[PDB]
Amino acid sequence: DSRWEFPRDGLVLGRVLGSGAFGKVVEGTAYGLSRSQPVMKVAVKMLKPTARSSEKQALMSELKIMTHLGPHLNIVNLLGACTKSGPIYIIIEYCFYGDLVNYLHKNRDSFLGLTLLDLLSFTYQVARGMEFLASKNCVHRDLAARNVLLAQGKIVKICDFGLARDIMHDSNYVSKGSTFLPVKWMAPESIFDNLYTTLSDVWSYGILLWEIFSLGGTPYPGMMVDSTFYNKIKSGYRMAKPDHATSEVYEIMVKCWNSEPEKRPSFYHLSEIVENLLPGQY
Ligand SMILES: *CCC(=O)Nc1ccc(NC(=O)c2ccc(C)c(C#Cc3cnc4cccnn34)c2)cc1C(F)(F)F
């Protein structure tokens, strides 16, 4: 679609927010990208010179998929793109607080500020975002706190850095076969039987909830991903309750970690359940 196209001379590129082996996301400023906000801060995903044609095809397809998702409050907001007469730029609205892991770490010590209600809100918003993606038949496959951004007003924005994360030198991604995988976030059917569904996303959402209510802890702390780890998961091992989880929130996580995928709750039902834990009703 040509509606998305934005001229390069209207885009200022700044510091790198994140980089992988062949892609990167840079902070930027866009001039004339909105009539109402003629000077607006953005993030821009682009390829590095290192990238080959396979990684260039993936960026164009990523743009194509993002155009077809349409907008949702809890997904990163696609604003425009640069495609003609140059390398592909994907322009997204800048999320003030950055990624959720670092946000949780920065606010862990002053936690009562950051409140339990804020954590419940993040939990609810992610579920609403994942519900949207599922409705578009998009399986995330890498849902984790590191792939959740936070905009001002404390609004969750699910994202996927993809090529802009160095999964080869990130401890959260374990070598398996030809590539590196977020094993500690993956459902057993994904690890051992290579099945990726919304229901496997629901497992990852449970791991994400553990991240939130541990205030950014590493899942299965101390445990290396090895054959001992793999066998524990198949045998029904699950993480204990994080410090700042209520019993209700822990029960939600355990439901997400059912060994049988069809027994995990939908992202829609998850939204309702978390809603009843929040004060007030709309
Ligand atoms: C169906 C599966 C699917 O579509 N997954 C998917 C794949 C790719 C994305 N793309 C992004 O998340 C994305 C692209 C480009 C850019 C620039 C950004 C960003 C950013 C940003 C904004 N503010 C900050 C602050 C610090 C660091 N980074 N910032 C993101 C998305 C998806 C999705 F899962 F959403 F569908």
Q: Entry resolution in angstroms?
A: 2.2
Q: What domain range is 267 assigned to? A: 100-275
Residue whose entry in the numeric block shows the structure tokens 């099945």: 195
CA distances from 176 to 163, 167, 168, 181 (A): 18, 12, 11, 7
3-class SS string, 76-132: CCEEEEECCCCCCEEEEECCCCCEHHHHHHHHCCCCCCCCHHHHHHHHHHHHHHHHH
- Do 159 and 59 lie in one domain? The reply is no
In a domain, 23, yes or no: yes
CATH number at residue 56: 3.30.200.20
161 part of a folded domain: yes
Residues 223 and 117 in one domain: yes
Way the structure was solved: X-ray
Q: Find all residues with CB under 8 Å of 77, minimum gap 6, and list them.
A: 71, 92, 93, 157
- CA dist 221 and 231 (Å) reads 16
Identity (one letter) of the amino acid at 253?
M
How far apart, in whole angstroms, are the C-alpha atoms of residue 149 and residue 172?
A: 18
**Which active-site residues does the annotation give?**
142
Distance CA 32, CA 27 (A): 17
Please tell me the distance from the alpha carbon of residue 223 to that of residue 72, in angstroms, as a whole number: 36
Q: Quick one: 122 and 87 in the same domain?
A: no
From 93, 126, 148, the end of a domain falls on 93
Instruction: Among 67, 93, 119, identify where a domain stops.
Output: 93
Choose one of 73, 93, 113: the last residue of a domain: 93
List own/partner pairs for 98-102 with CB under 8 A and 24 or more apart.
98/17, 98/149, 98/150, 99/145, 99/146, 99/147, 99/148, 99/149, 99/150, 100/145, 100/146, 100/148, 100/149, 100/150, 100/156, 100/211, 100/212, 100/216, 101/145, 101/146, 101/211, 101/216, 102/216
Sequence-separated contacts (24+) of 107-113 with Cβ below 8 Å: 107/215, 108/215, 108/216, 111/215, 111/244
Q: Are 257 and 238 in contact (CB under 8 A)?
A: yes
Domain identity same for 27 and 166: no
Residue of the nearest CA to atom 7 in ligand 1?
A: 160
Whether residues 167 and 46 share a domain: the answer is: no
Same domain flag for 172 and 224 = yes
Q: In angstroms, how far is CA 40 from the centroid of its own chain?
A: 23
Element (H, E) at 230: helix 227-234
Distance in Å from the first CA to the final CA of the chain:
38
Give residues (CB < 6 A) around ligand 1.
17-18, 25, 43-45, 62, 65, 75-76, 90, 92, 94-95, 98, 133, 138, 140, 149, 158-160, 162
Beta bridge partners of 24: 19, 46
Indicate whether 61 and 108 sit together in one domain: no
**Does residue 25 share a domain with residue 144?**
no
Residue 244 domain flag? yes
